[PDB]
Amino acid sequence: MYEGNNMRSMMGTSYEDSRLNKRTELNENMSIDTNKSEDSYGVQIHSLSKQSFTG
Amino acid sequence: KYLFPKINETLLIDIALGNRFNWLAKEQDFIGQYSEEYVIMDTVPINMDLS
Secondary structure (H helix, E strand, O other), X not given: OOOXXXXXXXXXXXXXXXXXXXXXXXXXXXOOOOOOOOOOOOOOOOOOOOOOOOO | OOOOOOOOOOOOOOOXXXXXXXXXXXXXXXXXXXOOOOOOOOOOXXXXXXX
């Protein structure tokens, strides 16, 4: 309500949102994509691609 | 009773063989003797007892 200059340097400008970033996520999906055992009545074992996790 | 015995066919029965693991084919340059890698140990969060 009162203005003054409500932006001061820090923690006068931090009672608002203050840069909501990298919220905790289910990008890798448990209980759906994993924790999954609905795997189809396939034919053979074709391949399982191995990737060196550089990143 | 005098002819040389007449041979007519050889074949060389031959088949190739497989791997069943060739989707693990990782090539390299063959340098260095030892190779290793690592992982981080977990650090569980904490109670902010700000006193």
